[PDB]
Design a protein around this nucleic acid. Structure first.
Length: 113
RNA sequence: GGACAUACCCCAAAUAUUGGGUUUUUUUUUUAGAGAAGAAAAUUAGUGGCGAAACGUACGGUUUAUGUCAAAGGAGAAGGUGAUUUUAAUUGCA
């Protein structure tokens, strides 16, 4: 529909072309970005609140891996936040050692694997 | 010298503009996104009093006959007499 529509540059498309870029990003933001900004916020909340440490979840690390592969399909600036998320949650583990949680030592699953 | 810790600082970042990183000094409390805002307590009457009989009557419990049914015994057990002969007393029967 976007490159079905007449590209033959009118004034309204020419005026915005000192700041802006292509029509596909301009209208994909209207119908795709509210869904990928939901996928991000779905993943981050599933990690952060629910599975802080809690030893009994290999799913936590499954989600982390899946959400890293999600960044290869869509936006990248929601991947620096993902790194910082893993950094602070790892920092949160070996600072307290204070709940029925992950013992990151000889334990092959919850240290190596 | 004034402002700054939810940093008024630091980094990161274009289709991105919101994520992280740090200073001490006091006390303070064991964690943090939850707990109070809904399923419960209670209530009773305008509930007449007293009260039989006729008729009717069950499963059972035990006593007494009764039929049939299981072991033990034909030494036993034990009932019946004018089949007999003499005789005073005791115990007696063959």
């Amino acid at each position: 529909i976007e490159d079905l529509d007449n590209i033959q540059t009118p004034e309204s498309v020419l005026l915005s072309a000192v700041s802006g870029e292509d029509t596909q990003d301009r209208t994909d933001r209207l119908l795709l970005t509210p869904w990928v900004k939901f996928l991000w916020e779905s993943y981050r909340q599933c990690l952060d609140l629910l599975r802080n440490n809690s030893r009994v979840e290999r799913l936590y690390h499954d989600i982390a891996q899946q959400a890293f592969k999600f960044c290869l399909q869509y936006t990248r600036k929601a991947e620096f936040r993902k790194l910082c998320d893993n950094l602070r949650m790892h920092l949160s583990q070996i600072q307290r050692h204070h709940n029925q949680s992950t013992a990151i030592n000889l334990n092959n699953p919850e240290s190596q694997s």
